[PDB]
Structure 1
Amino acid sequence: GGFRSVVYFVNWAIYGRGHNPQDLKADQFTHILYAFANIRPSGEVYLSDTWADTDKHYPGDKWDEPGNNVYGCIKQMYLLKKNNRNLKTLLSIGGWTYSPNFKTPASTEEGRKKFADTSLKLMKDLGFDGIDIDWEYPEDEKQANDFVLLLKACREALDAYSAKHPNGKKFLLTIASPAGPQNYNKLKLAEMDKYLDFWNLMAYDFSGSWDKVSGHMSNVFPSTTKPESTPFSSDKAVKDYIKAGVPANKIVLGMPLYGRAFASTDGIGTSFNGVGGGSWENGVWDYKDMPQQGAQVTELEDIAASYSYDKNKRYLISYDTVKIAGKKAEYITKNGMGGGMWWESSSDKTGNESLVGTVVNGLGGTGKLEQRENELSYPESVYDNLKNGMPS
């Protein structure tokens, strides 16, 4: 099958970022993953923002109208799917912020059963092609086994629904995973793999506020010359998953569409104090705001890493340029990996400067993307417009 092109659409982008599902270059992707869904102690998966998610009326939504109906970004993603039939959508559950509350439901059968059922309920009501868990991170051995069992719960859940609808489609189950060794070495990766459609390796956040020296935050290869500039590397993670037994073609390489900043720095590998501002939070800048005035951009192709640095303000921002995104595409093809994943859809540029554009083209263009037709039929949906495949 060809490569996957996965992006995350984040619940909250419809606010300050102004990004709605309508303005996704859908022909560029195969999988939109909508983040994030939260979990209750019970195991109950629920929607983080029913305004964004389900209720907001976009242009095109009759306010009035017969039926019990869904709107929000869920209707918009379904409309994206009706128009782009190779575009699948997955509900993504967890996130850095909600992962404190995965361990308690995951430890019991009731909790996992409840997780599986509520997740399926949500998928089949809202028109999703599957679900994606993002538990950062199972912190002990027990939590890891729990994660295999939870995965199993969800795989069994989704499959039962497909059994109930044999003329319809099979459904997806993925996870966002750790590129840091201290986290993935706790995971039972190969047992987990049995349940998953693919893995979205978060091959980023390798350097940031937490560190003492400015580093590369999503570099592919270790700097031999300057070890302190590369505390992690994509490559270590990918070949470690592969020695662990994950098929490479199931590993989708995560790439950031934002950059992490460092203040009071001479440059890469030196100490910094502070991280400055950001586009939305401190120390984090949207790639489409790069490059900032007065910074020179350095591209280190051999380890596939780049950064801007302003010599006067002594500020470093680790982020990928098109040349670097191209080197990343290169690694994906060369190593026969599952494709590219991006966090997150609003921070990218367009046209010739789209990082995603750049990767799809180095993948051989859209013609080399995995052709898997999505699911438009949701017979059991609790929403009438969605159940009826959204007419006008």
Structure 2
Amino acid sequence: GGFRSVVYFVNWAIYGRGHNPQDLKADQFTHILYAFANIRPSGEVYLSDTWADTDKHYPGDKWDEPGNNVYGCIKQMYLLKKNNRNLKTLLSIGGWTYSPNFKTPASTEEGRKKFADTSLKLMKDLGFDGIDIDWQYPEDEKQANDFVLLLKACREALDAYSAKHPNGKKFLLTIASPAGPQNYNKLKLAEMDKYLDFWNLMAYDFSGSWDKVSGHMSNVFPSTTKPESTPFSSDKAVKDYIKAGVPANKIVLGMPLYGRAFASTDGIGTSFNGVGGGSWENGVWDYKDMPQQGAQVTELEDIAASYSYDKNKRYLISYDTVKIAGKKAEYITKNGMGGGMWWESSSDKTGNESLVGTVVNGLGGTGKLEQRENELSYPESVYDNLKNGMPS
């Protein structure tokens, strides 16, 4: 089908980062994942920040509107949908901080239905085209099995809702998936695939502060000359997924819009101590703050990896440049993969230095993106302004 362009919009971005949904170049994406909803012990899914999500008024949002109305970033996401009919939005549930919360609701049938019903409720009230589940990660086979059951329960609730509105759209079920063999090898990949529209493979965080040696954090291919610099590779993951029965065109390659740093290092693949500063938190740098003054950039086109290194501070930052992004685009194209996904929208550069723009153009452009109309009708929404299509 065409290629997908998937981005994570993080709801805490509206604070210190100053990134609002209005700043998204909507025409370069097919799918926005709104992160992150949290999970109650009952299985009930709920919004993590009602201020950012529903309450904050933006310019254009009236104070005096009749009826029960939604504002926040949810309204802004619907506005984007109205204006770009090829743009779909999904409610992303879980993520790193919240993943502890999956195990208990997921272990029972009651828990699983509460999850499914409450997530569907959120979807149809807030105007989303589907839900994305990011359990990072199922610790073992039991959990992996429960996760398959969780997916089934959600897929049934979705379909049941579509059945209630035969002429309306179908809805999406998506997940973020592991690139590390020790995590994906315990999942029942072929089983899960039956329920999903597509797989956003988290092909990044291959290295970080948790290691003892500086490594490439999102490279495609392993290094034969320096194996220590590539603990992982996305190619290993993609190939294993396909062997397990997952179709290449349903796998979306996750790409970092940030870099991880290593301090007091002689270079890639050597020991390091500490991670230095960061754009917002230590050890992590936004792509848009790169390159750092005094750092030299090295591009390993063959393994598709890049990093900066400042000889004087002995500081290493593993992150992708435009060159390397075009190389990952190459890879998506060559292997007929489902598209590109990025974490996350606040940190890309604009214009010709944008990693997202580089990949979309390397995919043949916006015309080669999957064309699938989003859903604007939400007749069962509790929110007046949304079910009326945000007339205002």
TM-score interval for Structure 1 and Structure 2 normalised by the shorter chain: over 0.9
**Deviation of residue 320 (structure 1)?**
0.2
**Deviation of residue 208 (structure 1)?**
0.3
Distance 1:349 1:187 in 2: 35
Output one character per residue of 1:87-122: Cα deviation in whole Å (capped at 9) or x when no partner: 000000000000000000000000000000000000
**Deviation of residue 168 (structure 1)?**
0.3
Alignment match, 1:208: 208
Distance 1:109 1:333 in 2: 40
Look up the SS of the partner of 2:329 in the other structure: helix
**Deviation of residue 29 (structure 1)?**
0.2
Distance 2:153 2:389 in 1: 28
Distance 1:231 1:108 in 2: 36
Distance 1:221 1:282 in 2: 28
Look up the SS of the partner of 2:219 in the other structure: coil
**Deviation of residue 222 (structure 1)?**
0.1
The answer on 1:31 being equivalent to 2:31 is yes
**Deviation of residue 64 (structure 1)?**
1.7
Distance 2:181 2:308 in 1: 27
Output one character per residue of 1:216-265: Cα deviation in whole Å (capped at 9) or x when no partner: 00000000000000000000000000000100100000000000000001
Distance 2:60 2:272 in 1: 49
Distance 2:212 2:65 in 1: 57
Look up the SS of the partner of 1:7 in the other structure: strand
Distance 1:52 1:64 in 2: 20
Give the gaps of 5 or more residues in structure 2: none
Distance 2:70 2:18 in 1: 21
Output one character per residue of 1:319-373: Cα deviation in whole Å (capped at 9) or x when no partner: 0000000000000000000000000000000100000000000000000000010
Output one character per residue of 1:125-176: Cα deviation in whole Å (capped at 9) or x when no partner: 0000000000000001100000000000000000000000001000000000
Output one character per residue of 1:264-319: Cα deviation in whole Å (capped at 9) or x when no partner: 01100111000011111110000000000000000000000000000000000000
**Deviation of residue 177 (structure 1)?**
0.6
**Deviation of residue 53 (structure 1)?**
0.2
Distance 2:185 2:283 in 1: 28
Alignment match, 1:92: 92
Distance 1:62 1:272 in 2: 53
**Deviation of residue 82 (structure 1)?**
0.3
Distance 1:91 1:238 in 2: 25
The answer on 1:195 being equivalent to 2:164 is no
Distance 2:286 2:385 in 1: 36
Alignment match, 2:309: 309
Distance 2:67 2:193 in 1: 41
Count of residues in correspondence between the two structures: 392
TM-score normalised per structure 2: 1.00
Give the gaps of 5 or more residues in structure 1: none
Please list, as runs of the form range in 1=range in 2, the aligned pairs for 1:228-377 lying within 5 A after superposition. 228-377=228-377
Output one character per residue of 1:38-89: Cα deviation in whole Å (capped at 9) or x when no partner: 0000000000000000000001000121010000000000000000100000
Distance 1:228 1:64 in 2: 61
CA RMSD in angstroms, aligned pairs only: 0.4
Distance 2:266 2:293 in 1: 17
Output one character per residue of 1:174-208: Cα deviation in whole Å (capped at 9) or x when no partner: 00010000000010011000000000000000000
Distance 1:153 1:243 in 2: 26
Alignment match, 1:21: 21
Percent identity over the alignment is: 100
Look up the SS of the partner of 2:176 in the other structure: strand
Distance 2:90 2:22 in 1: 16
Distance 1:111 1:279 in 2: 39
Distance 2:63 2:335 in 1: 50
Alignment match, 2:151: 151
Distance 2:181 2:91 in 1: 27
TM-score normalised per structure 1: 1.00
Distance 2:282 2:105 in 1: 33
Distance 2:337 2:323 in 1: 19
Distance 1:124 1:145 in 2: 27
Output one character per residue of 1:365-384: Cα deviation in whole Å (capped at 9) or x when no partner: 00000001000000100000
Distance 1:375 1:60 in 2: 23
Distance 2:92 2:260 in 1: 24
Distance 2:240 2:354 in 1: 30
Distance 1:50 1:177 in 2: 27
Distance 2:142 2:174 in 1: 21
Distance 2:272 2:64 in 1: 56
Distance 1:64 1:22 in 2: 23
Distance 2:200 2:67 in 1: 37
Distance 1:64 1:267 in 2: 59
Distance 2:173 2:103 in 1: 19
Look up the SS of the partner of 1:302 in the other structure: coil
Distance 1:113 1:222 in 2: 42
Look up the SS of the partner of 1:78 in the other structure: helix
After TM superposition, what 4+ stretches of structure 1 lie above 4 angstroms from structure 2?
none
